[PDB]
Symmetry: C3
Subunit: 296 residues, 3 copies
């Protein structure tokens, strides 16, 4: 008579792996999920960040459920979503995870934050979804720039032991990727989009406006702190100490939501930015650039 969560955790264990990167004097471990039978594995960008930035000195391996250790190669990574894709070569009989639909997730849904069973300090935690589409700032691990993501929030503990592993619903389906870098997960629908671009192109392109903001709240939004020269914001009329309240069709509550809303804009297409300037309600038009132009 195995328990409710015991069954679900056991049903996905074969699909979760330990990811380990080591040099002469450093060792760095995480979890990941098998998402493609050819050997493609999804994890956090901060789990592999140092191996990616120092690939000549770091070696990355994958440890499966049975204990097999296999070399692993970095397909691509996205620090802006704290996502990354690895690939193991010609491994047979892989248990691929079942990818859910994070758009159907609801507050109160019971979830499991599953870490790799063989990880050093591995954890499997249980809780509910506490919030949806919740912008959360994430600290960049190495030279990686900090970022903000629309996260699924859960009161299941997200820690080093299950970071990079899957957030699992009661149907044993992946609805998110745990990120410890009061718990947060990268929703699986964004995960599928980012991993598709990383698998095909080895990188991903996100829109940018050249804006840096700080949060403001009074009788509220993202206050423009710096506008880059020649940027879409500078060419659109966005001024400094403007208070951004809407980017595209998304209302902006603070600096966190501003970062997320910008990534939802269309590159190369006009878009409205609603601001409040010295008390006045002003709307501006910006054409977002790609953040990496030679990959666009």
């Amino acid at each position: 008579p195995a328990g409710r969560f015991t069954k679900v955790a056991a049903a996905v264990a074969d699909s979760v792996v330990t990811i380990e990167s080591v040099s002469d004097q450093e060792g760095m471990q995480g979890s990941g999920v098998i998402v493609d039978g050819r050997g493609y594995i999804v994890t956090n960008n901060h789990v592999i960040s140092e191996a990616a930035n120092n690939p000549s000195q770091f070696k990355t391996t994958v440890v499966f459920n049975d204990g097999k250790e296999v070399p692993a190669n970095l397909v691509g990574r996205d620090p802006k979503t704290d996502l990354a894709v690895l690939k193991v070569d010609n491994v047979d009989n892989l248990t691929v995870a079942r990818l859910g639909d994070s758009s159907k997730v609801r507050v109160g849904d019971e979830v499991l934050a599953v870490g790799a069973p063989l990880g050093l300090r591995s954890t499997v935690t249980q809780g509910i979804v506490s919030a949806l589409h919740r912008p959360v700032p994430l600290s960049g691990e190495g030279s990686d720039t900090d970022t903000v993501i629309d996260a699924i929030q859960t009161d299941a503990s997200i820690n080093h032991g299950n970071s990079g592993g899957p957030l699992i619903d009661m149907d044993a389906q992946v609805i998110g990727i745990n990120t410890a870098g009061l718990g947060f997960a990268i929703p699986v629908n964004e995960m599928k989009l980012v991993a598709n671009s990383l698998i095909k192109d080895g990188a991903i392109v996100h829109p940018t406006l050249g804006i840096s903001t700080r949060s403001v709240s009074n009788a509220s939004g993202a206050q423009v702190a710096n506008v880059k020269a020649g940027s879409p914001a500078q060419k659109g009329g966005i001024l400094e100490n403007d208070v951004i309240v809407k980017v595209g069709n998304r209302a902006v509550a603070d600096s966190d939501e501003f970062v997320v809303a910008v990534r939802q804009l269309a590159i190369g297409q006009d878009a409205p930015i609603e601001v409040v300037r010295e008390g006045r309600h002003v709307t501006l038009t910006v054409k977002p650039d790609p953040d990496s132009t030679l990959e666009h």
Copy 2:
């Protein structure tokens, strides 16, 4: 096929509101619960504390489930129980919460700490009741005096995102009011009593003895640290460095339980205080005063 907690959270969402108070350079947000069809809303005293103390510069609104924003007026507040009552005027088709009975709550009962779905960093957390009638100290927000309450304790996370919202049982009934100011909730039976007095009178009166205590434990209770001149304690013979072990019919383990026990006394009626004085077991009689005499 919606989940166990998903159903309960969704069934009470229409009854939980976002409470927001703003000035020229300040913004303060919380949650509340609709408890009366005329428009009466219960929240924490620390959610509104600054608007109450600076009403000329702060404006308070209520945001409902559908997104409606409505002005809100402070009916009354009790810092000693960290409770407060707001009122929205002539709002139709209000979903009033179902108030449970906190005296029937038991350790192990599954609960939800529900925050306002539209709050900025809103949360809905899940856990069990971890303790009943647990005295807990609460820090006063502004110039508000600190206090202690008989709390329902839960291992559901109580945070800024669900503070002021309801603690909900598996029957979708309110058994407490969350207070973040390891989680604690104001039991609903005390909530009904305090809100009734605040709705009728705009304030509430609690008994007082003129005693300040610190906790002591050895081969134990509340040690009298200061007795106000002319107080019921001073007129009853209570001395300094007395160790209070019983107030009324309630045993007193420490300073926290002493504060709570005093509030359970009858105003204007004799009551026994059992103390241990230089090793001796002494009982004293005190007649508690109202803490605000012109409202009694």
Copy 3:
């Protein structure tokens, strides 16, 4: 209609007790579990540590569910497993706990961390098993030496309010002993072995090698930091800055697992220690001594 966890917590409440040790100017409280009808109670070593080290000034009592207070005497204690056994004399109609089998516990199993209902800040928390056989360091309370144990890890909160109490499965059976000294419990199968030796002999004997280690991880294990003179390690050839990777038949990931693995060796019997010495893979033979020779 009592809840799922409400029933289980209520079914074991009569078997959990408050343990309290007091002097002239100190007071120290914990929880324990009744494991034998003659009056034998199991708790943490850090709950009673100061009464054990200063028995002339500390007095220890047990408070049952109904409220009975009874003197308690220390049978034995093991700081290396943070376990201890008390005994109440000639108490009738004791509700003895049902001891489960921690070897059958699985990740995801629903558990309750039950504290003594009458304890000052007692808690009952709920969660799942997050990891099995997880080495965790524990800080010694008084002059007690720090230690490491193979723990059951749970995301049920382990705190002062339930430390020393039982970790309870959904069959109301004890699978571990809570230790607060992200939660950890002493598995019940080790608990039965340690308590048997403490009840019979008033103490327990654990193997030792004379090794102190620090953790290392690179392209990994316990690095030998100090070898005692004349120790089994010194007589076996173990050198300083050796990197221990296997003790007996147990792989050793870090210093935590090394401590635990040593306690699983046979006293007086040869055993292999696999090390990596200046790049070379070397195996050594050691004969573990008893840590207390006159009790062996």
